[PDB]
Amino acid sequence: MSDRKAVIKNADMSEDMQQDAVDCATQAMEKYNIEKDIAAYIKKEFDKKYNPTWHCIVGRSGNFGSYVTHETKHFIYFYLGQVAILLFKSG
Numbered sequence: 001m002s003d004r005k006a007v008i009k010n011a012d013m014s015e016d017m018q019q020d021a022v023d024c025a026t027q028a029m030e031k032y033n034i035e036k037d038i039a040a041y042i043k044k045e046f047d048k049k050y051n052p053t054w055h056c057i058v059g060r061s062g063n064f065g066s067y068v069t070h071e072t073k074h075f076i077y078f079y080l081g082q083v084a085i086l087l088f089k090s091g
Contacts, residue, residue, distance in 0.1 A: 005081030013088075017050070018076045021087050024056075025078055035083075042087065056087040 011018040024045050028038045035058045042056035055068075055075075060083050068075075068086055075088030 003081075005079065007079045009077040009079045009084075011076035013074050013076050017087065020046075020050075021056075021076050021078070025085065029080075039085070042085075046087065050089075051091075053091065054087055054089050057085065059084045059086070 008018070008022065011021075013021075021042070024042045025038075028041045028045070032038050032041050039056050039058045043054055046054035046056055055070075055072075062084075064077070064084055064086055068088070070090040072088045072090055075086065078085035078087070
């Protein structure tokens, strides 16, 4: 019995981001309980403190495997029971 997954999938970043992401993700979920604010709070917190711009997006097993490339060259991917977050920099 575990109705609260919340796990990370993969991350090809330096590491300071998957760390600041897991935190900005934890605080984003603690400060914000929405889906567009978590992505707007992590995307706004990332670009406003990591240089524009990051693609902190959220979803639910929709189609994060045929429209997240954009030549990322580095990114991270979180999971939250039915939800899927994708942070990265398409700069």
